[PDB]
Design a protein around this ligand. Structure first.
Ligand SMILES: CC(=O)N[C@@H]1[C@@H](O)[C@@H](F)[C@]2(C(=O)O)O[C@H]1[C@@H]([C@H](O)CO)O2
Length: 658
């Protein structure tokens, strides 16, 4: 179908444009689609892009609007006082503002479907809400509509929600166009998606992106595939990976690096209302916070992540128990059997389940997938699915049997309810991943695991040394391997905050000299330095010139291969804001060879200071461009939970940054 109205190049400069004569007499039937290409790089706090209203005295609550906020939220109002209807649908973090310093043309498609009684909004090719109602209100059927307006809503003769921006194209259709038709509308996106809702992971949500450039030129990414909304563990979360062989232009369909099967992989629309948004999958095992490195000697890619047993997350993990029993300088995974009140078993060499109360081996073994065998025979448990059909979250058996795993709620043998770290490897640069193995405990029997710093590990350029940063109360705990991740030792570095989420990322400034940048509780990013390949560490310093919130955000960091302004360069990615996870920046620092101090010379704003920017990953692509995969929303805010397709990827050149 062709549009009933089509207009373009409207400048919204805090003065509404009347298009009533052009549009109102063309509106007919109860279904409509609005397609709008617009820019707003300096928006007002709250502004309407498009309005249909009754402008008459006494009818201020009879209007339809498409509005946005300077937070990047998009929404509609559909109001008719005579019908007693006041619909307000919206989603935070749905917009782009600027890319490479130029205003972005957002493509908005709003579908008002009378037959299905559903209102659906897409922005930049992403569905941001779809709302079905019992009593449908057609948008041009509001009582006494007499104004069609761009850049405001006329209420009682006055301009409300005045806009700054521009509408480069606007079309309306007297039809609810199909999802397939929507997908054919040309986009002008500054970004691309690597992981997205409906892909092979079947997770509706993603968090904690990583990026790493492999020696072959393949660029690898990992991520938390989060099923139960965007909540951290306890939940169901798998670790997924995807790679690009063409400098980030296209990406492979994701596969899993680490996955559990005690709960079904379900694509679920997690509730965002205040009553239910804290619904949390409570009986599933999960992985969370992954990190990647490449090993030169073996050629293997190595991925670590935290592992959480069923119903466990950082909040309820036993802080006083590693989950391992120490014997002669050997650590063995403890197990508790159905009906016992103690952990009376251990897993020894070749996966043999051993009874500690009698010092006898049992007829149970644990295979390499941490699954339980009896007499070489695989035990199973019944899988769970989740649903909100009852009006609240229900987790219930679904009839499918899956291998019994010691991390599962329903297992005959269960691990200590605490957090662990696991590693897996790939021999084919991320086309497949091995079965994961648990790392041993590093801080003794009676201390829970450290928390892996998501992002990249560090492969020292001049040796086979691999380092993964982790954190715990009062220190960074660097995990060091010189034998392709076969064995690990820790190097502890005290930090002057307790209770910090001290997510740390490292760069090699030069041979054997490592600077680590990390999140703190002070509002400033901190750093420390090693000059002996991670054996020992300096005291902690802080970066001036970048602000974080009190709780802080992950920072990603790389050593750029090329000189900038004749100097060695480090690039940091972080929000720059004292208020929230917003104002994303790449900050370019030039190294002073005299003392290894860094001058933070260039700040590149990823998008508007008010638009969301949280965890991020950065990598130098083989062509010397910079790839950035980042959470484009405030992942701390309790108002921005459970958003789909907000982890996004962009390509930048150094000249863009400087
Ligand atoms: C292991 C783990 O929970 N890791 C978590 C991460 O996956 C994040 F989501 C985050 C966070 O957004 O700050 O950091 C922690 C968590 C919170 O601060 C508790 O540390 O929320």
């Amino acid at each position: 179908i062709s549009p009933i109205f089509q207009g373009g190049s409207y400048q919204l400069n805090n003065k509404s444009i009347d298009i009533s004569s052009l549009l109102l007499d063309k509106l007919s039937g109860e279904s409509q689609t609005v397609v709008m290409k617009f820019k707003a790089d300096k928006p007002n706090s709250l502004q309407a892009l498009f309005g249909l209203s009754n402008s008459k005295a006494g009818f201020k609550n009879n209007y339809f609007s498409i509005f946005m906020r300077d937070s990047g939220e998009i929404g509609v109002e559909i109001r008719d006082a005579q019908k007693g209807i006041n619909y307000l649908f919206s989603r935070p973090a749905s917009l782009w503002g600027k890319h490479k310093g130029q205003a972005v043309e957002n493509t908005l498609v709003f579908v008002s479907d009378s037959k299905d009684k559903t209102y659906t909004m897409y922005v930049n090719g992403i569905e941001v809400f779809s709302e079905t109602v019992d009593t449908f209100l057609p948008i041009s059927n509001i009582n006494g509509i007499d104004k069609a307006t761009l850049g405001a809503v006329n209420r009682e003769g006055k301009e409300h929600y005045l806009a700054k921006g521009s509408i480069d194209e606007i079309s309306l259709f007297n039809k609810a166009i199909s999802d397939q038709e929507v997908s054919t509308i040309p986009l002008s996106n500054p970004f691309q998606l690597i992981f997205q809702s409906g892909d092979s992971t079947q997770a509706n949500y993603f968090r904690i992106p990583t990026l790493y450039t492999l020696s072959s030129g393949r660029v690898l990414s990992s991520i938390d595939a989060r099923y139960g909304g965007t909540h951290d563990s306890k939940s169901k979360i798998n670790i997924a990976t995807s790679y690009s062989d063409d400098n980030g232009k296209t990406w492979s369909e994701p596969i899993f690096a680490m996955k559990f099967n005690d709960y079904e992989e379900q694509l679920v629309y997690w509730p965002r209302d205040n009553k239910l948004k804290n619904s949390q999958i409570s009986g599933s095992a999960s992985f969370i916070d992954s990190s990647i490195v490449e090993d030169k000697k073996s050629g293997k890619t190595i991925l670590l992540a935290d592992v959480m047993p069923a119903g466990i997350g950082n909040n309820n993990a036993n802080k006083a128990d590693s989950g391992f029993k120490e014997i002669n300088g050997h650590y063995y995974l403890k197990l508790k059997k159905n009906g016992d009140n103690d952990f009376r078993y251990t897993v020894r060499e070749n996966g043999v389940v051993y009874n500690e109360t009698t010092n006898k081996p049992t007829n149970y073994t644990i295979n390499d997938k941490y699954e339980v065998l009896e007499g070489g025979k695989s035990l199973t448990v019944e899988q769970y699915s989740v649903d909100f059909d009852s009006g609240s979250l229900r987790e219930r058996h679904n009839g499918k049997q899956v291998p019994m795993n010691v991390f599962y709620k329903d297992s005959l043998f269960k691990v200590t309810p605490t957090n662990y770290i696991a590693m897996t490897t790939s021999q084919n640069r991320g086309e497949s991943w091995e079965q994961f193995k648990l790392l041993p405990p590093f801080l003794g029997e009676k201390h829970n695991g450290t928390y892996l710093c998501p992002g990249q590990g560090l492969a020292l350029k001049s040796s086979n040394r691999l380092i993964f940063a982790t954190y715990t109360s009062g220190e960074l705990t660097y995990l060091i391997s010189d034998d392709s991740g076969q064995t690990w030792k820790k190097s502890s570095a005290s930090i002057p905050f307790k209770n910090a989420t001290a997510e740390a990322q490292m760069v090699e400034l030069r041979d054997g000299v490592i600077r680590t940048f990390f999140r703190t509780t002070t509002g400033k990013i901190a750093y420390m330095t090693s000059r002996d390949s991670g054996e020992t560490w300096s005291k902690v310093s802080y970066i001036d010139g970048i602000q974080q919130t009190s709780y802080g955000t992950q920072v990603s960091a790389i050593k750029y291969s090329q000189l900038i302004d004749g100097k060695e360069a480090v690039i940091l990615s972080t929000p720059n804001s004292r208020s929230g996870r917003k104002g994303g920046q790449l900050v370019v620092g030039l190294v002073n060879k005299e003392d290894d101090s860094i001058d933070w010379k260039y700040h590149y704003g990823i998008d508007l200071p008010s638009y969301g920017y949280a965890y991020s990953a950065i990598t130098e692509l083989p062509n010397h461009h910079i790839g950035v995969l980042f959470e484009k929303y405030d992942s701390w805010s309790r108002n921005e939970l459970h958003l789909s397709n907000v982890v996004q990827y962009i390509d930048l050149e150094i000249n863009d940054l400087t």
